[PDB]
Each structure stands twice: as C-alpha cells, then as structure tokens.
Design a protein around this ligand. Sequence first.
Ligand SMILES: [Fe+3]
Length: 283
Amino acid sequence: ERPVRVKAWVEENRGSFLPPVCNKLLHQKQLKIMFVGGPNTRKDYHIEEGEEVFYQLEGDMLLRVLERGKHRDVVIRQGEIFLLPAGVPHSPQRFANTVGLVIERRRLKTELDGLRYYVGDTTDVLFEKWFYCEDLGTQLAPIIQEFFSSEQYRTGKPNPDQLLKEPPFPLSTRSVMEPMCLEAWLDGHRKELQAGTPLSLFGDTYESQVMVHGQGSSEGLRRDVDVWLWQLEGSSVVTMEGQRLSLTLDDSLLVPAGTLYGWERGQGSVALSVTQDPACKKS
Ligand SMILES: [Fe+3]
C-alpha cells in the first residue's frame, strides 16, 4: 500500500488464521514475513537450513527445541524476541489468544526442509518427510495430514523402511540463546541510539541481521536481498525512486532487493531493520 501498519493489518487479518498452521503471510519474496495465531498445537519438529526470528506481539508461546540431542523448552513471552539458528529441530506451541511474528527467507535451490515426529518424548524418529519449501503458506498442511492419516500415528511404531539412515545435512550442535525483552533492551541502549550509531541486536555469528536505528540519516543504499523496516517509535522518511514514503508509529515497509533507497529518521525515532542474506549463511 505501502507502508502497512502492523497491528491494523493483524487485527484485520486474524479472521483468516486457519488450522492446522494458523499462519498468514504479509510478504513472500526473498524475505518471508508471517504471522501466526493460536491456540495451535504442533506435534511436529521442523528443520531448515535458514534462520528463524520470533517476536511475540500478543501473549506467550512455547518453543520446544532439540539442542545437541536434548529436549528443551523455551518460553517466549509477549514483547520478547528470539533468533533460532539454522538446522535446529523446533516445535512451536501457541496458546489461546496469541499472535506472533516469524521471519525466514526463500530457500536456495539446494536447501532442504524436513519434518519429524518422535516416539514419546524420546529422541527416536517415528516418521519423517523431507522436501523443497517453496510456499510457506501452503506446504506444511498436506504433510501434517499425512501423519495423522498414517499407520505410524495409529500405532506408534516407526517403520524402519521409511526412515533415513542419516539426515541430508548435519543437524546443528550450537546452543540456543535466551529470549530478550525488546523494550528493556531499547531503554538499555537509548543513549547510543540518540547518538546516531545503528546497533546489531544479535551480533555477527548469524546469517540474520536485526539492526536498530535511531535519529539520523543514511545514504543511497542498494542491497542484493529484501529488507524490512518497522517503525517502533517516532517517525521517518524513506526515499526510493523519486518517491517519499513516510513512516509513523508501528508502520512498516519491505524494500525489495535491487532497489535504491535513502532513509531519514527524525528526533527520538526508533526503527527496526531486518535482513537474511544467505551469502552470510553459517556453514
Ligand atoms: Fe520452522
């Protein structure tokens, strides 16, 4: 339209979260920006070669992970933000009356997504499926149905003929971070943002870059990947192709790869800048 105001977009589009996945995409080019409501129980663990960034807009969630072969529970509460590194199996439980933000990116021609259901709360695979992920809005469903309409589900015995000897790429062995409370973080760094220096939220051992920007401007910029901007405080002006688009509180905007842009940020503004560039992949 664009900018799109995030809470107005959610409040309008939440009547279209449909089971089993309860998701709807805002954007689906190089960057994928999607929202998911609950209640919604996922018994499956997803594995992918890109990174996933979560931010809880409304209410809490529970992310179950496998971190070095061990089950782990990761509560992400309203206002918290968290980055999941590549190749970690994860299973998101969302509860009644919650809305969440998830970001990911388009997968390379050779990258492979997988789904696994385990036996009980053990680490033994019961059922798995591996596929090229093209359309985040549409492909998990058919996979989930297949598990619920299956012998493995009816009985709980794995069929060894349908397991893989090894996963197609080695699962990650890194540890997972703690969720950060975004606005305790902002207030914690407000002096630096007033100064004009942008800041990395998660640092550079990841592919994703979540940069926070305060007052000031920056020169003509052209990136090879999509960029998403989200205005949290104050306001700002984006310039792309002889075209000023101003952003106010809670406005957001995807600048498409290739597109040349200037950004002017007014007094006491605070904007979020997100990028997932697979040239910055960490394997
Ligand atoms: Fe996932």
